[PDB]
Structure 1
Amino acid sequence: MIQRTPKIQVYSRHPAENGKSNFLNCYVSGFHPSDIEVDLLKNGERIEKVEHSDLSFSKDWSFYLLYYTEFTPTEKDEYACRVNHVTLSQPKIVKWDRDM
């Protein structure tokens, strides 16, 4: 049984502009099996009403999913993605960097 860890990317749909509405995305890809847990976080706390694309896969059969949510970035607020997967010994948390 093969197991490939998910690659994680947390970013915004548009360039981050404080006080301006946007979309926070957490794209997970290159993973297998498909069972996966992804949570968007605001200052350490889970955001509610996070939508996600339907499971699909790439040429090498590895899966990818897009988790997103509307949000209005500010100077202080901290955003991150928390991912759980059978390949991960513990929940991996990726912080949003308005430059990546």
Structure 2
Amino acid sequence: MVQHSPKVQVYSRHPAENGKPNFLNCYVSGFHPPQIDITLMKNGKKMEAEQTDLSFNRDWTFYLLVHTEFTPTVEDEYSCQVNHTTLSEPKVVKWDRDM
């Protein structure tokens, strides 16, 4: 085979005005094989969320968007945890609202 590791960004649809309703975005992409596990975390807990359909780029590396409505507070933490064969552990990335 030929395997590429998943690249993950976690970001707010709209910049994080503290309090208001927003949308939390996990964009994972650039990976092969397609089989991948993706969950959004509420302080460490799986948030239900929708996942886009399996599409890919012209270099055949797949991409997916898992996203659910959320509302940013000042003190609770959100993060994406992703699972995939190229990775020895589940890679997990928290959401810096400056990115």
Q: TM-score range by the shorter chain?
A: over 0.9
1:7-22 matches, within 5 Å, as 7-22=7-22
- Matching residue of 2:35: 35
Q: Which amino acid aligns with 1:73?
A: P
Distance 1:17 1:55 in 2: 31
- Matching residue of 1:84: 83
Distance 2:27 2:98 in 1: 16
Distance 1:45 1:29 in 2: 23
Q: Which amino acid aligns with 1:89?
A: S
Alpha-carbon deviation of 1:23?
0.4
* TM-score where L is the length of structure 1: 0.97
Q: Which amino acid aligns with 1:44?
A: G
Matched, 1:52 2:51: yes
Detail structure 1 runs of 4+ shifted over 6 Å in the superposition.
none
Question: How many residues align structurally?
Answer: 99
Distance 1:68 1:61 in 2: 23
Alpha-carbon deviation of 1:59?
1.1
Unpaired runs of 5+ residues, structure 2, are none
Q: Secondary structure at the match of 2:69?
A: strand
1:32-81 deviation per Cα after TM superposition (whole angstroms, max 9, x unaligned): 01000001001111112x10110000010100000000000000010000
- Matching residue of 1:2: 2
